Design an enzyme around this catalytic site. Sequence first.
Site, PDB file in Angstrom:
ATOM      1  N   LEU A  72       0.781  -1.218   0.000  1.00 40.89           N
ATOM      2  CA  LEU A  72       0.000   0.000   0.000  1.00 40.89           C
ATOM      3  C   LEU A  72       0.819   1.276   0.000  1.00 40.89           C
ATOM      4  O   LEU A  72       0.349   2.361   0.346  1.00 40.89           O
ATOM      5  CB  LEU A  72      -1.056  -0.011   1.116  1.00 40.89           C
ATOM      6  N   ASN A 120       1.776   2.749  -2.591  1.00 39.67           N
ATOM      7  CA  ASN A 120       1.359   3.533  -3.740  1.00 39.67           C
ATOM      8  C   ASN A 120      -0.063   3.272  -4.215  1.00 39.67           C
ATOM      9  O   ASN A 120      -0.395   3.545  -5.364  1.00 39.67           O
ATOM     10  CB  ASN A 120       2.306   3.394  -4.946  1.00 39.67           C
ATOM     11  N   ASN A 142      13.799  -2.014  -3.144  1.00 36.15           N
ATOM     12  CA  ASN A 142      12.477  -2.515  -3.461  1.00 36.15           C
ATOM     13  C   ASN A 142      12.415  -3.375  -4.714  1.00 36.15           C
ATOM     14  O   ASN A 142      11.632  -4.320  -4.816  1.00 36.15           O
ATOM     15  CB  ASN A 142      11.515  -1.349  -3.707  1.00 36.15           C
ATOM     16  N   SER A 202      10.449  -3.516 -18.557  1.00 37.64           N
ATOM     17  CA  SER A 202      10.278  -2.262 -19.274  1.00 37.64           C
ATOM     18  C   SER A 202      11.179  -2.099 -20.486  1.00 37.64           C
ATOM     19  O   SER A 202      12.296  -2.612 -20.490  1.00 37.64           O
ATOM     20  CB  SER A 202      10.835  -1.205 -18.322  1.00 37.64           C
ATOM     21  N   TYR A 232      16.226   3.323 -11.705  1.00 35.42           N
ATOM     22  CA  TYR A 232      15.017   2.562 -11.914  1.00 35.42           C
ATOM     23  C   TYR A 232      15.205   1.614 -13.075  1.00 35.42           C
ATOM     24  O   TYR A 232      14.957   0.427 -12.938  1.00 35.42           O
ATOM     25  CB  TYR A 232      13.802   3.450 -12.179  1.00 35.42           C
ATOM     26  N   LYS A 263      15.507  -2.700 -13.198  1.00 34.13           N
ATOM     27  CA  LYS A 263      14.707  -3.600 -14.012  1.00 34.13           C
ATOM     28  C   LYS A 263      15.576  -4.572 -14.786  1.00 34.13           C
ATOM     29  O   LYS A 263      15.334  -5.777 -14.844  1.00 34.13           O
ATOM     30  CB  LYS A 263      13.788  -2.841 -14.950  1.00 34.13           C
ATOM     31  N   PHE A 299       5.777  -0.931 -22.506  1.00 32.73           N
ATOM     32  CA  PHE A 299       6.027   0.321 -23.179  1.00 32.73           C
ATOM     33  C   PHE A 299       5.423   1.443 -22.343  1.00 32.73           C
ATOM     34  O   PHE A 299       5.897   1.616 -21.229  1.00 32.73           O
ATOM     35  CB  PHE A 299       5.765   0.223 -24.700  1.00 32.73           C
ATOM     36  N   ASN A 300       4.397   2.167 -22.811  1.00 41.05           N
ATOM     37  CA  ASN A 300       3.819   3.255 -22.021  1.00 41.05           C
ATOM     38  C   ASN A 300       2.357   2.979 -21.725  1.00 41.05           C
ATOM     39  O   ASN A 300       1.483   3.249 -22.548  1.00 41.05           O
ATOM     40  CB  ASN A 300       3.945   4.606 -22.777  1.00 41.05           C
ATOM     41  N   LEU A 308       2.835  11.346 -18.995  1.00 38.24           N
ATOM     42  CA  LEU A 308       2.059  12.205 -19.847  1.00 38.24           C
ATOM     43  C   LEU A 308       0.546  12.147 -19.697  1.00 38.24           C
ATOM     44  O   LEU A 308      -0.097  13.182 -19.501  1.00 38.24           O
ATOM     45  CB  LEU A 308       2.587  11.976 -21.287  1.00 38.24           C
TER      46      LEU A 308
END
Lengths: 338, 338
Positions: B33, B35, B99, B124, B149, B153, B178-179, B200
């Site tokens: 929790l 986030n 994390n 990612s 980050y 990954k 991707f996004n 975005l």
Amino acid sequence: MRVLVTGGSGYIGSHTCVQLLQNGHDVIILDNLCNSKRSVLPVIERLGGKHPTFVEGDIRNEALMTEILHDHAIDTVIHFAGLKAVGESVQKPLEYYDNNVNGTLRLISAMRAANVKNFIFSSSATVYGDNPKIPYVESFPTGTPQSPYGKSKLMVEQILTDLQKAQPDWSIALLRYFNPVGAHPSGDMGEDPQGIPNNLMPYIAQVAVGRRDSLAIFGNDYPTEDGTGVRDYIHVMDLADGHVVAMEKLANKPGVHIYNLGAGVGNSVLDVVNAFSKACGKPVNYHFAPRREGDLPAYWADASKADRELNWRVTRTLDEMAQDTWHWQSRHPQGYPD
Amino acid sequence: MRVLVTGGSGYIGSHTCVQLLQNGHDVIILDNLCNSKRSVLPVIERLGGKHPTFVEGDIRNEALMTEILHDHAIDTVIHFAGLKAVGESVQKPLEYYDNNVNGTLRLISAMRAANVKNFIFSSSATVYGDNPKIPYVESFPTGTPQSPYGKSKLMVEQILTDLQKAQPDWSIALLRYFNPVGAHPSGDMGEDPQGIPNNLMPYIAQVAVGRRDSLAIFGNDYPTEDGTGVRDYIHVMDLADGHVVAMEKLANKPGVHIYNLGAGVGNSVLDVVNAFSKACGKPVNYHFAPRREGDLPAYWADASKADRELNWRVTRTLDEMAQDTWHWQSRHPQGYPD
Ligand SMILES: NC(=O)c1ccc[n+]([C@@H]2O[C@H](COP(=O)([O-])OP(=O)(O)OC[C@H]3O[C@@H](n4cnc5c(N)ncnc54)[C@H](O)[C@@H]3O)[C@@H](O)[C@H]2O)c1
Ligand SMILES: NC(=O)c1ccc[n+]([C@@H]2O[C@H](COP(=O)([O-])OP(=O)(O)OC[C@H]3O[C@@H](n4cnc5c(N)ncnc54)[C@H](O)[C@@H]3O)[C@@H](O)[C@H]2O)c1
Ligand SMILES: O=c1ccn([C@@H]2O[C@H](COP(=O)(O)OP(=O)(O)O[C@H]3O[C@H](CO)[C@@H](F)[C@H](O)[C@H]3O)[C@@H](O)[C@H]2O)c(=O)[nH]1
Ligand SMILES: O=c1ccn([C@@H]2O[C@H](COP(=O)(O)OP(=O)(O)O[C@H]3O[C@H](CO)[C@@H](F)[C@H](O)[C@H]3O)[C@@H](O)[C@H]2O)c(=O)[nH]1
Ligand code: NA
Ligand code: NA
Ligand code: NA
Ligand code: NA
Ligand code: NA
Ligand code: NA
């Protein structure tokens, strides 16, 4: 200075501790004893000429690390602790990542907590990956290590780098070791591997002492002068000295200081065998076997940078490396007592 | 199947949970929790049409992970949990490594302990690094991510790979996202970032809802058709569906299955803005600002492999992505209730 030496009871760390004490620093050794024995402690103090404090524990225990850091008012940390058996790392990756990656992470996290900002990490030429360009120079971009062990080392270098960027007051030395061999000149301290030695020197030593039959020379068709693999061997005492100097000169000097620690020259398997035969007074038995998986043909370090910046260079010879090892092996055939 | 979904209460995980439940799987959500909010749970069950079990806890707690695994007879684990704020990762690297790297390590260590051998990891496109070749294809060698980050990954992908090699019975899917954008069609579930949104779509949404003044378009001099950055946006529902399929088809299929999950086409910042303006019925305010540090100009995925092997492809459009987001934003301007 007040220094915490993780892995201090191990091969490289023990020798470094002695040199550190000789220089009058206050030493706290932290070790989990997974790959060393308490029986080395008295030798360290004797040869070091001063008492080092010993704490039995694991780098993975952040709370304990933090406590030690504060309790002993540590100024700088030399981090030798971790697992290093390449082959085993392939079979047991998680243990490697845990002890090395997480292990270091917990340790530097404790440092942050205790406001300690000077670090020295035991790195490796493995980080260069499969580099055709030799000798290896610190300015080369890193490559891709072939074992989990190698990868774990590069991952830490990276984590350390980002940490320094985020905490620019830190001084972090990435010491890339080549092939450490040799033992203290007294013959009372040295490498004490358990079981089958994975490295060349100790294996040869064990063959010489009468424990093993013959040395298996992994490959004899390499594109080298004699067909055997070429590496840069460095006496553990020189390595030790380099650590003291790096610690003393880089403390409180912000940045990520990367240095290759090697002799700057290569020697083949045969060169090593020959030196040992000479040292022990009898021809070392050996035979040729197939190439070992993941072995590179030839490489050595370019150690100009450390010379330039730290005024450090090796001073022991290959012969010495062999003589010293034989002396220790011969004086203590059972290694350190249980 | 019985599946443990770490990070299940988060953006991507919540949507995946709903799709998972719709397919009649038994879902156990594990989330700390940090986030997300518990208030999403009832929505998951409602939209999922079945009750998922929730456990509040941290992936870093290996003992707890092991317990959950055994207790619920888990067959497969979908690992979404971790930290993902790129900029913050630069400022606070250790938290990211802890994390993500350690976090995953603890989790797979528990799996080993509980004999669970099917894993799906949220990866990612960052892992491709600065690749000039686009679209990105799974056969390309990985590069060097620019943030802690991104690096975290790639490190996990590597650890997972070595693990599979050592435990060849494991089936591990590396899903390179991707996004991700969009929200559940109901408008009752969606991304609920706290504070300033880094991505975005949500930023645009917040501008549209009247929370922010104007969208800062980071850079307008890129070598792209309109000068703005180009990316591959994928609806979270498509992403979710991909997870279910991957889980169902790769379970018990030994290997490391790498798949890019994207629409396979790029859209610029302006394209996105325009779609949103259309969706919300008013022109979205925006201005041009300087390029953002570490931003690449244009990239998208080659998603042929997933099509071929899993018979999976996106089905939602960019317009839908925008419409769905607006609907959620508009229906729940305060996100999930405390
Ligand atoms: N010896 C080499 O050929 C080689 C070359 C490259 C790098 N290194 C690195 O240098 C360092 C020293 O290597 P070495 O030859 O002295 O090895 P070593 O095994 O003799 O020393 C390592 C010490 O770390 C301790 N240790 C291991 N995991 C620990 C943990 N989690 N918590 C606390 N203590 C722990 C062991 O008990 C041991 O005393 C290691 O990091 C190794 O990876 C050595
Ligand atoms: N959203 C994106 O743009 C993006 C693209 C690439 C990769 N990813 C990855 O996909 C995953 C899902 O991302 P998302 O957008 O849903 O993010 P999210 O933050 O909404 O979901 C992550 C969830 O993990 C939980 N969590 C974090 N650390 C935890 C820990 N140590 N123990 C337990 N729970 C923990 C958070 O509370 C949260 O609910 C993440 O791993 C993210 O890195 C997402
Ligand atoms: O029984 C043996 C042992 C070694 N060798 C040869 O001796 C040389 C030295 O081998 P070592 O195992 O002693 O050391 P490495 O060069 O393999 O070690 C290096 O490469 C490893 C893998 O990249 C790293 F883990 C490590 O940090 C680094 O010092 C190599 O050419 C090796 O093939 C033999 O012929 N027989
Ligand atoms: O306020 C904003 C936010 C974004 N953008 C632009 O919109 C595009 C998308 O930006 P996002 O931040 O939404 O997402 P990213 O492409 O930066 O994210 C990707 O790149 C990151 C860094 O490599 C990874 F962490 C991550 O996994 C990956 O999805 C980029 O061209 C960005 O410059 C703006 O102009 N204004
Ligand atoms: Na900073
Ligand atoms: Na051993
Ligand atoms: Na012994
Ligand atoms: Na194996
Ligand atoms: Na936030
Ligand atoms: Na809210």
